[PDB]
Amino acid sequence: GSHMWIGVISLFPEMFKAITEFGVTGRAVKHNLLKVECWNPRDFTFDKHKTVDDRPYGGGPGMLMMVQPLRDAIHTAKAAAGEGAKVIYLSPQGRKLDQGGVTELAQNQKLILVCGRYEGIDERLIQTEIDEEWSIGDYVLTGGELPAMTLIDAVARFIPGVLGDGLLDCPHYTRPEVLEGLTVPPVLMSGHHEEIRKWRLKQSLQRTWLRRPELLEGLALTDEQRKLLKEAQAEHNS
Amino acid sequence: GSHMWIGVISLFPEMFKAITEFGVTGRAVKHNLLKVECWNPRDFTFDKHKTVDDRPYGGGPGMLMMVQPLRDAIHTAKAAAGEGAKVIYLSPQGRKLDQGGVTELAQNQKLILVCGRYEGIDERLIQTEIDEEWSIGDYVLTGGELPAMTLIDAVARFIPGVLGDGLLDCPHYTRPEVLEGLTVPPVLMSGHHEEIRKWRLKQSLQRTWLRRPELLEGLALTDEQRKLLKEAQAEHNS
Ligand SMILES: Nc1nonc1C(=O)N1CCN(Cc2ccccn2)CC1
Ligand SMILES: Nc1nonc1C(=O)N1CCN(Cc2ccccn2)CC1
């Protein structure tokens, strides 16, 4: 349907088996809802030792990805993708990913994700080959592979067939009715669908307010949400 | 040395091969700097079909992880860990992970990471078994495995032997000297180490200011940084 094709450039393509062979994303791939295709810069090297890193001009302790194998891998992925593929570099210097950002990226039918290693890629490749730079969070990882897999997983949820409001989630409960002395809220046992809905929404508003108050600032709360939030705050203040 | 032990509770333990078998984290594991040990709730089931999900009280479209197999897996991981292990649940309702948070978690010698699937785990298990809840970002994934692997990768960088200031990174350049008409900044070719240092720091300040101005607010800039930032801003304003 709205199937998605994601090309990946990575020195460790076998890492992506974690999403292509298991769980929800694994099923998406099996059912041809998601296609993930990997190119390894190591395969585009020509020297005997298949060199994929290179020294930075200006010195320093680190290395960068070697330009020629990486550039050639990217070009190969672009040729396979055809027209309309957006090329993404994952790094801490990119636009911070959130769910709105995920929904934006998910509108793309084709993505190419470039996974950096070492101290990253040549700035001129970012200028000449990368459409958008994104970060999955303000922390530093050993490479772009986990970020790429995280992005793939998040956007995959928006492909129709893959799955079976700005607020944090409400608490959920399952069997048994009592667990180390802790009981399930009686409302959830009541069978009263409307009370249960309002209880869940109220809990969500309360948890967002207590844990992530700044998320509430970004919202235009509905009349019902304003009411339930006021109630939750009143109860919190006893 | 400051080796780290990380217990993992996951319905898809084979996903963690992406970090235990490859790259920097793979080497950490091989060199016994990092130990990652997985328990699968499916192995703690007793029914013929090894059931690991259960219906939420109060209804709704989703499922939760079944309490008994998950609880038993967690208890088993805690027994293996001995004393001092901090138990973490990964979810969008948790404390937002950043590099400071990574450095905090990395001070722990033992971690147990609980990977949720479905609509997550019973709220009472969070109360009774989880020490801390963390989020790797404000977006929704299909399960806690990629978040757990991301956390493991980030904290692993702080284990001594694993690897070979609040600002975004400077641009980096490697061979060739000219790439699609784009040249390497002459300062990086100059061999003047102090000019190169100041240029890199200035670029870092400029990029942070242009891309992530709010990160600058959280910093107490050094005298040198204040100067170079003013210069970068002056040049930006031509
Ligand atoms: N945070 C993140 N959100 O996406 N990716 C990351 C992330 O930490 N990494 C690890 C280091 N990389 C290689 C690198 C190093 C320095 C500059 C540019 N590239 C990028 C991928
Ligand atoms: N963002 C994140 N940072 O850490 N983990 C995530 C994340 O998206 N997920 C996927 C859904 N999970 C299962 C679940 C669903 C609802 C409530 C609680 N648990 C948690 C793991």
From Swiss-Prot, chains A, B:
Any one Pfam family match given in the protein's UniProt record, by short name: tRNA_m1G_MT
Sequence positions that bind S-adenosyl-L-methionine: Y89, G116, I136, G137, D138, Y139, V140, L141
Catalytic reaction equation(s): guanosine(37) in tRNA + S-adenosyl-L-methionine = N(1)-methylguanosine(37) in tRNA + S-adenosyl-L-homocysteine + H(+)
Subcellular location: Cytoplasm
Keyword Transferase annotated: yes
Enzyme Commission numbers on file: 2.1.1.228
Similarity section: Belongs to the RNA methyltransferase TrmD family.
UniProt name for this protein: tRNA (guanine-N(1)-)-methyltransferase
Gene assigned in the entry: trmD
